[PDB]
């Protein structure tokens, strides 16, 4: 669990994040970094190169949908599980992704704010967001069966 | 690496397998689908009934596949280079999940051969599994 | 989470297990099979081969100890977190035992009932014990830090 | 294995922390034991506070290690021989750990080096610790 520091820098750290840009860039990143992640999207055209993947639009929308889902179950850190159930129940029961994916988007999404952040990206701010991107990935996992 | 005690040992107890090999891939699947269900994820188009004859007909080419890797032990990265190139560029399953089935192959071999899978015999046949996953992950990226 | 037929699973082949043989036999092979393993037992003898490990007295006891502790947690599984708790402290500080050991252990555990118990450890049987390791090694690992 | 590209953007990359090896391994080691706590369950014997001289200077030698690894990238189980053998017999640190202080060491880069950590780079580093990783741990059985 987070401790109230821990909330209170995620938090403050996230008051800064442009959500769509990180969104897009951590997607692309999944794809080029972990490129069997792409299994999901082979409807969104090119993704032959890095700067194709990153450039691509279609990933690019898919970043700001599923940041932006991210990004609102921070408001409710404290009940992940409720807050991503029916979602964890469709990834499930009709999307057929591999929870694994997200811990990798989760492993993505660090290096990316630690890209975008630098320093200020410090040891304690990653424990407490290690443990933001392990609950989120818990709670979209618990649905499946 | 595998040793030439580990081979040895894999060898004789794939032998004992013998013409059971298929049936025992199909029981590896169906324990791996009960008991880590997001594996379930890979086979939308399947129906994974006990008894299934999908899974069956899985399990009949994945042992066969185990077979064709034991016959090379020495000379596997060629002789699962096609799989290699399929799982890695078409199917995409996540590499966490091979060593789910690996552990669910490992467990049923143990409940099929109460005199050969000895401690050591289970340390090699670990070994195997995991070479065998790494060569099917090895193109992946 | 078990189900119902998961708890009778469970406790019917635990019904048959002698506790004190297959928690030294588990205990051995994990010492065989990930000989890392033996880095928490300097103190205990011979472990040069596999048919040292395995007859080793010293073995053979701590496994009835671990597996007898692993056997009265059986009785309330619907709170292993509480029931273990005490063990988990101990082993974060004071044995410096990495919690992987714990995860390992529930596998070669699964692979001992395997082979000595054969067609009755079935897929569903398997599948209750899985969910029965996991929540162990969890609840044993729940008070590091 | 890493291709050339790979090999060519390690070398870049890892060339650009030249002198703060040693600032750069501490830091991964520090965010790692506040990330993943059990990996402090190998360091009771360390004064692991923050800017202790046990973690500084084991992060210089973690840091030093990958320099040689990067140095001879095209032969590292052979450059790093002594380290695999002294991972394996003696430290036996379990091998889920590596992938986490490898997360670390990528996250530190990624803090440090915004010029260079391009989607490609980043690909790259991932591959190159994880094969660091797997040599490390290629003689534990
Ligand atoms: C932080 C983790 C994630 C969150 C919060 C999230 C959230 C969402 C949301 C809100 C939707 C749209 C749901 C709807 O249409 O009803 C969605 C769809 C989808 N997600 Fe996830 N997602 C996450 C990670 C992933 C990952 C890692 C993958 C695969 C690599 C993935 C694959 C998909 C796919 C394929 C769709 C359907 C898209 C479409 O129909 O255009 N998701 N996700
Ligand atoms: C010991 C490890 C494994 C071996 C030897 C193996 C072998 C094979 C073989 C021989 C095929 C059939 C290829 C063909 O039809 O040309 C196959 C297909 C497939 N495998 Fe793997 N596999 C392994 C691990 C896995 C794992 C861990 C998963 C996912 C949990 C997986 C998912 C699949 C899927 C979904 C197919 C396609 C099945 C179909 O649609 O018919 N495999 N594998
Ligand atoms: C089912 C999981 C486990 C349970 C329930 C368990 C339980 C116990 C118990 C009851 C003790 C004796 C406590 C005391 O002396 O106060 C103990 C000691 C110990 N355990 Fe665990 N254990 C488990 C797994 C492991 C594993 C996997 C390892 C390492 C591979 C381990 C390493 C140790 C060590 C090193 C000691 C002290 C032995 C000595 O006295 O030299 N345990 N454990
Ligand atoms: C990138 C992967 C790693 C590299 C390059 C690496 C490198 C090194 C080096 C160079 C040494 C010192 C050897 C000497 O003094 O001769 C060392 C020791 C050590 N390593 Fe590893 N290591 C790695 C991963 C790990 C991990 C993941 C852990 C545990 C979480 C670990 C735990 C230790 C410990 C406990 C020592 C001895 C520390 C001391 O007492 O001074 N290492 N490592």
Same mark, same amino acid.
């Given at each position: 669990?987070?401790?109230?520091?821990?909330?209170?820098?995620?938090?403050?750290?996230?008051?800064?994040?442009?959500?769509?840009?990180?969104?897009?860039?951590?997607?692309?990143?999944?794809?080029?970094?972990?490129?069997?992640?792409?299994?999901?999207?082979?409807?969104?055209?090119?993704?032959?190169?890095?700067?194709?993947?990153?450039?691509? *639009?279609? =990933?690019? &929308?898919?970043?700001? @949908? /599923?940041?932006?889902?991210?990004?609102?179950? $921070? +408001? #409710?850190?404290?009940?992940?599980?409720?807050?991503?159930?029916?979602?964890?129940?469709?990834?499930?029961?009709?999307?057929?992704?591999?929870?694994?994916?997200?811990?990798?988007?989760?492993?993505?999404?660090?290096?990316?704010?630690?890209?975008?952040?630098?320093?200020?990206?410090? *040891?304690? =701010?990653? &424990?407490?967001?290690? @443990? /933001?991107?392990?609950?989120?990935?818990?709670? $979209? +996992? #618990?649905?499946?069966? | 690496?595998?040793?030439?005690?580990?081979?040895?040992?894999?060898?004789?107890?794939?032998?004992?397998?013998?013409?059971?090999?298929?049936?025992?891939?199909?029981?590896?699947?169906?324990?791996?689908?009960?008991?880590?269900?997001?594996?379930?994820?890979?086979?939308?188009?399947?129906?994974?009934?006990?008894?299934?004859?999908?899974?069956?007909?899985?399990?009949?080419?994945?042992?066969?596949?185990?077979?064709?890797?034991?016959?090379?032990?020495?000379?596997?990265?060629?002789?699962?280079?096609?799989?290699?190139?399929?799982?890695?560029?078409?199917?995409?399953?996540?590499?966490?999940?091979?060593?789910?089935?690996?552990?669910?192959?490992?467990?049923?071999?143990?409940?099929?051969?109460?005199?050969?899978?000895?401690?050591?015999?289970?340390?090699?046949?670990?070994?195997?599994?995991?070479?065998?996953?790494?060569?099917?992950?090895?193109?992946?990226?």
């Amino acid at each position: 669990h987070l401790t109230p520091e821990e909330k209170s820098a995620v938090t403050a750290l996230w008051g800064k994040v442009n959500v769509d840009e990180v969104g897009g860039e951590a997607l692309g990143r999944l794809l080029v970094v972990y490129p069997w992640t792409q299994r999901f999207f082979e409807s969104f055209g090119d993704l032959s190169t890095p700067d194709a993947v990153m450039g691509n *639009p279609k =990933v690019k &929308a898919h970043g700001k @949908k /599923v940041l932006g889902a991210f990004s609102d179950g $921070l +408001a #409710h850190l404290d009940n992940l599980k409720g807050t991503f159930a029916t979602l964890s129940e469709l990834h499930c029961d009709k999307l057929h992704v591999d929870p694994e994916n997200f811990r990798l988007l989760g492993n993505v999404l660090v290096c990316v704010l630690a890209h975008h952040f630098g320093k200020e990206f410090t *040891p304690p =701010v990653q &424990a407490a967001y290690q @443990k /933001v991107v392990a609950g989120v990935a818990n709670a $979209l +996992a #618990h649905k499946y069966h | 690496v595998l040793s030439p005690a580990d081979k040895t040992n894999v060898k004789a107890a794939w032998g004992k397998v013998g013409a059971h090999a298929g049936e025992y891939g199909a029981e590896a699947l169906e324990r791996m689908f009960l008991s880590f269900p997001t594996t379930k994820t890979y086979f939308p188009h399947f129906d994974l009934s006990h008894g299934s004859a999908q899974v069956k007909g899985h399990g009949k080419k994945v042992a066969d596949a185990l077979t064709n890797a034991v016959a090379h032990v020495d000379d596997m990265p060629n002789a699962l280079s096609a799989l290699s190139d399929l799982h890695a560029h078409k199917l995409r399953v996540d590499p966490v999940n091979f060593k789910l089935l690996s552990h669910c192959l490992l467990v049923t071999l143990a409940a099929h051969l109460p005199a050969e899978f000895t401690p050591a015999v289970h340390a090699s046949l670990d070994k195997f599994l995991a070479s065998v996953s790494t060569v099917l992950t090895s193109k992946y990226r």
